[PDB]
Design a protein around this ligand. Structure first.
Ligand SMILES: Nc1ncnc2c1nc(Br)n2[C@H](O)[C@H](O)[C@H](O)CCOP(=O)(O)OP(=O)(O)OC[C@@H]1O[C@@H](O)[C@@H](O)[C@@H]1O
Ligand SMILES: Nc1ncnc2c1nc(Br)n2[C@H](O)[C@H](O)[C@H](O)CCOP(=O)(O)OP(=O)(O)OC[C@@H]1O[C@@H](O)[C@@H](O)[C@@H]1O
Lengths: 1290, 89
């Protein structure tokens, strides 16, 4: 609103009538109306001055002045909706660039993918409800699902009133994006009812407007359902012909613009629709159709549109002028008598053209055939005309696909594009596949992947780099990627001005998210080159920015799908906690829980086909995911439902024992560990019976110390025996000379901390030392283990000086109590009491306050016990013992409060947090098992009493991870394992979809969807005369040629209205022929049917009719008589040479289409023409035509040789249809075709060396012969005739 | 606020379907949705009936959920600005 009010008045300007002509005609009791028609005695309301020289009368040029616009703002239509709609006020001469810039940037509109235009008559009309609902629904759907502009008129009467009505109908529901059907309106400012309440300079912000129908004259009121208005000025009061020219110019300039989103660029398609127009719609339809807009006329309730619908598929030129007159005399009752005999001619000619081209013209057929929702009909006509456009190199296919992907309708893609036009090698769909992936279009990616594009290909290094650059610019990954991009300093070292994206940048942040333990996925830098597993990277690109539907589609064809499915959950959980959101932070946390279930469901499929091979893939280092296993990812990703599957627990129980069998029990293990000579007999069990039957006595002894459960039992027994020994010395061995167990308690308490060196020091994955310390501090059990030494802190001095008996016993006794509390951790192994200790560790909290609930009142009643005794006494020492005894007696025995009031408080505080923990404790404990299992696997194989032998032996190895949970497999076997995994994943996905389609809700939805199409089903139930030479608007000539219908085109035919303007060339004198544009002076002396020297007067057609000294066109009356663009008065001779050879494959043989050969023809275009033409021109020299014909092509020396070789085959000679043909001058052509039989040598190499076209102009190029080859309309008729020369397929 | 008064007129005499339609376009819709429940609970205890006294006590529990569901929508778009409307006269 600040930079908008500035960019309006000093570039846009308004017309005004400065001069003061009085009123030639006074109308409707008004004298202020003067020609143009504003107020005041003068023509306008400006200063009443002589206004420079007082030249009589005014000229719309001399006396129209352009001054800056003063009216603009946000119109509000009183109480009829509060929406605030923009409006600007312009004039005739404003370039469309200014309006486009304003409308795109300042107004805030977005560039559309389609420009639908609504032009129609303004006489109010009323139409049947069926067609009415069809039009409304079709227009709204086609204009909402594509985000198209609906540019139309701004009046409140007619078709534009109908479209305002349809926009209101859309706003009635407005399921989402209510203010998205933006409809810019174009109307004349000079004819508005309440326009004086809008003229406010330097900002008419919310300028209220009042609409009142049946209160005007011929002027018009504004609409209320449009979104934007652009009003045009002319300094006129009652004219209606000023908005159409500017609208056509702007609408033409819009289609020139190109939209580039996702890597594919298209020029905006442009479509037109009409509904019962009047006299000016036969302007707009012609003006649109001649350009190439797919005009869509609707059959039904039509004054004009119904005329085209009626005369629509009846073939061209089969209609007579009288037939058109009788067609028109049955529909126009009001003015059937005011139709001039010349008004028929214009309509006949324009209907002739429009209905002649049926490729551009399209009739709706409201209910007969093709009676769809109108949206697909409009799109179908648009793609018809797009297919009809020029294309040389298979461009129609790619353009139509690009446009379909630009829109969001897959039905169009599959029913028009992907069904037809052949070919489409799967590599061809790659460029648009990138845009489909970038714009998040899952339907189109499914369709493309159906047609043959393989995800194994199309993921190149370049393509991946392109995709990461165009990542969604609203993502946490985008922000962090930008940060790492800018923070790397020796990357800008080469060029600090521009930051360059590379592959390692995404890899670093990916490692940051996924974990330290993995190596970077993409190696540091140090044609098409795929990386290993080209699907994992596309899977990352799809997962990171939270693309649900793309994610499953890409994961459906992954190499390894347990590791990938778990990494996808780890990344999501890591990136779903520091996002600072509540919508996507909740969406990703739920998508992670779904990839969790994907990983779980794929693995149980493998665990049911086999047992031993279902764990070798559980523990195998993956080279495509950071050199990590499938178990460490789940354990570190907090996957609570995967590590407690049962197939994971069996594998953990198996390593909990080792190489020995599990179906033995715990009692037998204790019996054997207690009795050392109890393993050589048949008591303990074994698996892998090769060592059980042939039992090695040496291996049997080593196996138990290898097993970790034996190590755990030795540790627990050693710790318990230590604790008993400490109790023993607490009892009786307490001598000032250190008892035989003082050094022993020191050393065997060091036995705990020396292993703590191993637990704390070891870092299987690269982790910081301070992180290690923080992790150690975060453990409350480790805090108790440290608190053992913490209560040592007061014990060593008490031992050193043993006199402090009374203070010092308590320190060591509480140290014993803390030792016993630490002993309680042993039950985590116990399956039945492990989770039970887990819940008790959360039970511990309630005691801290139930103690304040119990002890305080117990002590209070103990106080009352002494208060009962005696009142006043002074014995601090004695009352202490007395109160202690009383409290002890009360505790031992009070019954009213202990058993009744407190007990249920306790039981309830228990049971509240007991309830609802049955489900989660199992998962928690089965998760916590692995840490202890791995710790005891990493522990040494010696009892704590003796473990010093290994503590003194693990130093020489260092001076000069294990294969149980992480190992490398052999590649040949790994390939078979991966193929087995692929087969089982396919089976699992297939079963999953088959079983999910059977849900009752899905079945009900299927019935509901099936009944709707069925409800829809039940509810629904050539003359050969010249044509180009007869078009209106003679090229580059302001005067328009008089319309001549095909009925009276020949000279001999009856005709009575002949009045064409005398055609005048720009410079007829320099033609070197008769300059007589007007035949007043017959200076020309043309020797008819004879040679006249410099100017040829001999025609190939033959003796033509001559009258009044003006040569008559033999073909017929073109409609314009005069000098013409042709050089000479009368016929002009030319020759068009063509070089034709059979198009050849790599073998050199003639190439075949389905029908016949291909001809290869050389064509040349110059940039200014914007069309292709044969290298032929007017034969200025009589002796040597080719020199002037193709002087810019050959050499004139090489073309002297070409003239020596100029002896070929004569294809066509006779009259030519050319747009310059006036009634006086016409063009006749000679066609010579030189053909090449072999391509080894001769004239081909002669022309190759015979080239001087490099002097100037554009390129000279060979071409194929095709129906859509870009050439002039009838200049290619010569080539079409030449097709018969050598059996050509068109 | 020419809608709050029509909302009172619709709520007081227990007009279910009119009540939601009028509340759909209210200025402030946590305070209004809570006052509509307070009025209903106050006027649904001294009515001397069993049909409408039970209908209004259930309509109050529905404007309760309307007020709750509107506020969690504000509490998920922002954190600090979702309480400045919680405490504003
Ligand atoms: N908003 C208006 N626009 C054009 N005329 C209007 C308008 N309001 C009124 Br009041 N009238 C007058 O009526 C004209 O004098 C008509 O002659 C009268 C009968 O209406 P029609 O004859 O049925 O329709 P056309 O004359 O063919 O003009 C079609 C135009 O061309 C398209 O590009 C669009 O800009 C327009 O729709
Ligand atoms: N099949 C056609 N053959 C020749 N002209 C054609 C043809 N169809 C069209 Br429609 N035209 C019109 O001419 C275009 O509208 C141009 O505006 C006219 C010239 O402008 P250009 O396009 O730049 O030049 P050309 O068309 O390639 O050849 C013109 C040569 O040059 C002049 O001196 C003349 O003596 C020669 O005929």
């Amino acid at each position: 609103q600040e930079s908008l009010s500035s960019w309006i008045p000093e570039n846009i300007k308004k017309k005004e009538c400065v001069y003061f002509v009085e009123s030639s005609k006074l109308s409707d009791a008004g004298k202020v109306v003067c020609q143009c028609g504003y107020t005041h005695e003068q023509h306008l309301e400006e200063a009443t001055k002589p206004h420079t020289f007082q030249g009589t009368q005014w000229d719309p040029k001399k006396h129209v002045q352009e001054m800056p616009t003063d009216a603009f703002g946000d119109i509000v239509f009183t109480g009829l909706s509060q929406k605030v709609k923009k409006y600007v006020r312009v004039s005739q001469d404003t370039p469309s660039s200014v309006i486009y810039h304003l409308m795109t940037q300042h107004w805030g509109l977005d560039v559309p993918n389609l420009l639908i235009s609504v032009t129609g008559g303004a006489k109010n009309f009323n139409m049947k409800p069926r067609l009415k609902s069809i039009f409304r629904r079709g227009l709204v759907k086609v204009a909402q699902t594509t985000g198209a502009w609906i540019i139309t008129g701004g009046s409140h009467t007619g078709v534009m009133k109908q479209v305002g009505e349809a926009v209101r109908d859309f706003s009635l529901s407005s399921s989402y994006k209510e203010g998205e059907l933006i409809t810019i309106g174009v109307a004349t400012w000079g004819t508005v009812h309440r326009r004086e309440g809008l003229i406010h300079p330097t900002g008419s912000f919310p300028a209220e407007y009042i609409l009142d129908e049946d209160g005007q004259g011929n002027l018009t009121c504004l609409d209320s359902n449009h979104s934007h208005f652009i009003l045009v000025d002319d300094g006129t009061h009652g004219q209606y012909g000023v908005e159409i020219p500017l609208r056509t110019r702007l609408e033409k300039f819009i289609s020139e613009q190109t939209k580039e989103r996702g890597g594919v660029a298209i020029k905006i398609p442009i479509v037109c629709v009409v509904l019962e127009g009047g006299p000016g719609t036969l302007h707009t339809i012609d003006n649109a159709t001649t350009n190439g807009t797919p005009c869509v006329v609707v059959e039904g309730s039509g004054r004009v549109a119904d005329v085209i619908a009626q005369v629509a598929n009846i073939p061209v030129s089969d209609i007579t002028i009288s037939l058109i007159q009788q067609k028109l005399s049955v529909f126009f009752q009001e003015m059937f008598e005011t139709f001039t005999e010349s008004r028929i001619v214009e309509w006949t000619k324009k209907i002739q053209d429009i209905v002649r081209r049926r490729q551009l013209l399209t009739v709706f057929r409201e209910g007969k055939d093709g009676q769809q929702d109108v949206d697909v009909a409009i799109l179908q006509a648009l793609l018809k005309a797009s297919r009809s456009q020029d294309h040389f190199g298979h461009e129609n296919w790619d353009h139509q696909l690009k446009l379909a992907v630009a829109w969001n309708r897959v039905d169009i893609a599959r029913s028009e594009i992907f069904m037809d036009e052949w070919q489409w090698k799967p590599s061809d769909l790659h460029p648009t596949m990138t845009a489909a992936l970038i714009s998040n279009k899952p339907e189109f990616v499914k369709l493309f992947l159906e047609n043959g594009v393989q995800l194994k290909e199309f993921v190149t290094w370049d393509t991946l780099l392109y995709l990461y650059e165009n990542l969604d610019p609203s993502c946490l990954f985008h922000s962090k990627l930008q940060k790492v991009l800018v923070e790397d300093p020796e990357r800008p070292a080469c060029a600090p001005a521009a930051p360059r994206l590379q592959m390692h940048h995404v890899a670093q942040v990916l490692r940051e998210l996924l974990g330290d333990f993995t190596q970077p996925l993409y190696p540091r830098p140090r044609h098409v080159t795929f990386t290993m597993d080209p699907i994992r990277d596309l899977l990352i690109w799809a997962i990171v920015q939270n693309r649900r539907e793309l994610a499953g589609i890409i994961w459906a064809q992954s190499q390894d799908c347990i590791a990938a499915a778990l990494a996808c959950s780890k990344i999501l959980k890591e990136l779903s906690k520091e996002e600072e959101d509540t919508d996507s932070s909740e969406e990703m946390l739920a998508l992670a829980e779904e990839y969790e279930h994907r990983a779980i469901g794929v693995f149980t499929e493998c665990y049911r086909k086999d047992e031993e091979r279902a764990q070798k893939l559980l523990t195998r280092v993956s080279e495509a995911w950071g050199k990590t296993t499938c178990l460490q990812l789940a354990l570190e990703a907090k996957d609570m439902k995967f590590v407690s599957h049962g197939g994971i627990q069996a594998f953990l129980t198996k390593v909990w024992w080792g190489q020995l069998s599990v179906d033995n029990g715990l009692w037998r293990v204790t019996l054997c560990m207690l009795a050392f000579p109890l393993l050589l007999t048949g008591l303990i069990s074994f698996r892998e019976k090769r060592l059980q039957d042939v039992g090695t006595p040496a291996a049997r002894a080593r196996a138990f110390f290898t097993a970790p459960v034996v190590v755990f039992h030795l540790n627990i027994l050693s710790y318990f025996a230590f604790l008993c020994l400490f109790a023993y010395v607490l009892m009786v061995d307490f001598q000032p000379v250190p008892s035989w167990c003082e050094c022993a308690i020191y050393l065997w308490l060091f036995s705990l901390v020396c292993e703590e060196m191993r637990q704390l020091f070891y870092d299987p994955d690269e982790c910081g030392l301070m992180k290690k310390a923080a992790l150690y501090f975060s453990d409350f059990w480790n805090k108790l283990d440290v608190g053992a030494i913490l209560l040592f802190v007061a014990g060593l001095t008490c031992r050193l000086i043993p006199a402090t008996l009374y203070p010092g016993r308590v320190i060591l006794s509480l140290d014993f109590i803390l030792f016993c509390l630490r002993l309680m951790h042993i039950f985590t192994i116990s399956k039945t009491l492990g989770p039970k200790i887990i819940i008790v560790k959360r039970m511990m909290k309630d005691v801290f306050f139930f103690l304040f609930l119990l002890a305080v009142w117990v002590v209070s009643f103990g106080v009352a016990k002494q208060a009962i005794l005696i009142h006043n006494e002074r014995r601090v020492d004695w009352l202490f013992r007395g109160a202690v005894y009383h409290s002890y007696l009360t505790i031992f025995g009070y019954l009213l409060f202990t058993n009744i009031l407190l007990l249920n408080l306790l039981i309830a505080m228990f049971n509240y947090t007991f309830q609802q923990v049955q489900e989660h404790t199992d998962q928690i404990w089965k998760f916590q098992r692995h840490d202890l299992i791995e710790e005891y696997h990493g522990r040494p194989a010696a009892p704590p009493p003796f473990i010093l032998l290994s503590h003194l032996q693990l130093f020489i190895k260092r001076v000069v991870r294990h294969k149980q949970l992480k190992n490398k497999l052999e590649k040949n076997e790994e390939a078979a394992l991966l193929s087995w995994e692929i087969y089982l994943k396919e089976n699992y996905l297939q079963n999953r979809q088959f079983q999910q389609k059977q849900r009752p809700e899905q079945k009900i939805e299927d019935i509901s969807n099936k009944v709707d199409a069925m409800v829809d089903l039940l509810d629904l139930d050539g003359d050969s005369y010249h044509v180009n030479a007869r078009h209106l608007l003679y090229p580059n000539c302001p005067v328009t040629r008089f319309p001549v219908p095909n009925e009276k085109v020949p000279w001999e035919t009856e005709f009575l209205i002949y009045d064409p303007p005398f055609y005048t060339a720009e410079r007829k004198d320099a033609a070197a022929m008769d300059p007589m544009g007007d035949t007043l002076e017959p200076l020309s002396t043309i020797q008819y049917n004879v040679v006249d020297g410099l100017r040829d007067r001999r025609s190939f057609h033959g003796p033509y009719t001559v009258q009044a000294g003006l040569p008559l066109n033999p073909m017929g009356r073109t409609g314009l008589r005069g000098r013409g663009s042709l050089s000479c008065f009368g016929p002009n001779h030319t020759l068009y040479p063509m070089v034709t050879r059979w198009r050849r494959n790599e073998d050199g043989a003639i190439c075949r289409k389905s029908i016949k050969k291909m001809l290869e023809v050389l064509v040349v275009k110059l940039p200014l023409s914007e069309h292709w033409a044969l290298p032929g021109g007017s034969r200025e020299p009589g002796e040597m035509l080719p020199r002037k014909l193709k002087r810019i092509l050959r050499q004139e020396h090489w073309p002297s040789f070409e003239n020596l070789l100029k002896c070929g085959m004569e294809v066509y000679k006779g009259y030519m249809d050319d747009p310059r043909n006036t009634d006086n001058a016409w063009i006749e052509t000679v066609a010579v075709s030189v053909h090449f039989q072999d391509q080894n040598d001769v004239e081909l190499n002669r022309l190759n060396s015979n080239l001087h076209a490099c002097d100037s102009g554009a390129s000279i190029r060979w071409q194929v012969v095709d129906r859509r080859i870009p050439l002039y309309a009838n200049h290619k008729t010569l080539l079409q005739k030449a097709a018969a020369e050598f059996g050509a397929h068109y």
